[PDB]
Amino acid sequence: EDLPHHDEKTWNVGSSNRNKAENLLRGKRDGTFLVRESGCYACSVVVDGEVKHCVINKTATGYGFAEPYNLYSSLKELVLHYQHTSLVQHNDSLNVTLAYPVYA
């Protein structure tokens, strides 16, 4: 019953790239997502039938999608927040939550 997001291996694919992310998310439902590393981090998430990508900033104050909200202490804390809060506030093309970990 607890969210699958609590196991970071269900969504953090480690060192990867945009193409690999597209192949992993192809055919997945809206809200399926992953976090990838290498520009250190990014989020790939399915929105309205398309795979979308955005940067995850790693700053002095924490992780986030945009200032003044780069304040999450870890990637897991970031993911848990955006599991219930839409990314739409940061981008009108990203009206989605991080609902389904790619490997859950």
Side-chain angles (χ1 to χ4, degrees), residues 22-37:
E22 297 232 5
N23 289 335
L24 287 173
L25 293 168
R26 201 181 40 252
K28 304 289 187 175
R29 65 198 146 146
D30 296 348
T32 306
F33 74 98
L34 58 83
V35 173
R36 54 189 169 86
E37 309 168 345

Side-chain angles (χ1 to χ4, degrees), residues 36-62:
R36 54 189 169 86
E37 309 168 345
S38 76
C40 59
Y41 305 91
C43 179
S44 301
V45 55
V46 184
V47 192
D48 300 337
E50 298 176 30
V51 181
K52 301 205 189 168
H53 309 271
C54 67
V55 182
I56 287 165
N57 307 302
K58 183 179 186 222
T59 74
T61 54

